[PDB]
Structures are given as C-alpha cells and as structure tokens.
Curated annotation (Swiss-Prot):
A Pfam family the protein falls into: Pro_isomerase
Crosslink site: Glycyl lysine isopeptide (Lys-Gly) (interchain with G-Cter in ubiquitin): K27
Catalytic reaction(s) noted: [protein]-peptidylproline (omega=180) = [protein]-peptidylproline (omega=0)
Residue positions, PTM N6-acetyllysine: K27, K43, K75, K81, K124, K130, K132
Phenotype upon changing H125A: Loss of peptidyl-prolyl cis-trans isomerase activity and interaction with HCV NS5A. Loss of ability to stimulate MAPK/ERK phosphorylation
Protein's recorded name: Peptidyl-prolyl cis-trans isomerase A
Organism whose genome encodes this protein: Homo sapiens (Human)
GO terms of molecular function: cyclosporin A binding; heparan sulfate binding; integrin binding; peptidyl-prolyl cis-trans isomerase activity; RNA binding; unfolded protein binding; virion binding
Span of the signal peptide: none
Record-listed cross-link Glycyl lysine isopeptide (Lys-Gly) (interchain with G-Cter in SUMO2), residues: K27, K81
Family from the record: Belongs to the cyclophilin-type PPIase family. PPIase A subfamily.
Residue numbers bearing the Phosphothreonine modification: T92
Function statement: Catalyzes the cis-trans isomerization of proline imidic peptide bonds in oligopeptides. Exerts a strong chemotactic effect on leukocytes partly through activation of one of its membrane receptors BSG/CD147, initiating a signaling cascade that culminates in MAPK/ERK activation. Activates endothelial cells (ECs) in a pro-inflammatory manner by stimulating activation of NF-kappa-B and ERK, JNK and p38 MAP-kinases and by inducing expression of adhesion molecules including SELE and VCAM1.
Segments forming domain PPIase cyclophilin-type: 6-162
Amino acid sequence: VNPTVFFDIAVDGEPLGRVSFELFADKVPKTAENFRALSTGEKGFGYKGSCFHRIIPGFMCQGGDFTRHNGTGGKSIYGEKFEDENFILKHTGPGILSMANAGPNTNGSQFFICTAKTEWLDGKHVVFGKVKEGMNIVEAMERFGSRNGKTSKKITIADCGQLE
C-alpha cells in the first residue's frame, strides 16, 4: 500500500540514474503525503528541476529547496511549515529519508537522504521513507559532495513522480 516515488538524477545535465523511495504512509501519513505530492507535482509545484544543494560524504544528501535552491526556501503542500508528525521511526542506517527543519514543528519541503547511521537525529527529525532501489546512485551522488557540503557539479532532479 505504501507509495513508491522516483527521482531521475542528473549531473550537470547528464543523466546519472534513478532512485526510488518507499514512503511510510502507514506510519507517517501527513509527512509521506507531502513528499509524494511534491514528487508528482500534482498541486502545481514540487521537486522537478530542483537541486541537491548540500552533500556531505559519509553523512547525507540534502535537497528539496525548490524556491531558493540553497537551503533557505521550500514549502509544504500544507502551507509554509507543518508540525512534526511523530518520531516512530529512527535513523538506522544509509538510505533513510528524513525531514530537514529549523526547530520544532518547522517542516517544509527540504529532506535529506542519510548515507550513514545518524542516531543523534532521532526524535528531532521525522523519518518518513527509505531508498528502495538505486542506493548505488545515491552513493554516486556522494562523490560530488565535499566536507562543507558544497557540490562540485550541479545535482538536479531532472524528473520525478510516482511509480506505485
């Protein structure tokens, strides 16, 4: 029943590969629905064409700022911010999909893909999905990151949507 969405990733316009995510709508429905709708664009705005603005190898890939492209923008389908839904799920290893925020109850559209176990984020960021296919593409994206998070090449979501 849990939806699966995909991103097609491009490096400097050149196709890199596809990553698919399972969204845990069974446990975090409001959070999962936000990501799903932003991935299909069905509300008229969303992730297509946006970049991953912060990539720290051995830590995570961060994206979802489709309004200022640098970590200061984004918005949810529910308004500018929405609440922390729950902290049922934990940051247990690579492939976890979790919400970025600016403090309690500040979720918008930014998210990060963990490329390591990040237990210190438990109870502070809402985990809502995991990589299903293409973890190897995430590992490839990592090689364009750096210690301070700046990317050497532009990593963009060339296309995205729902598979199931």
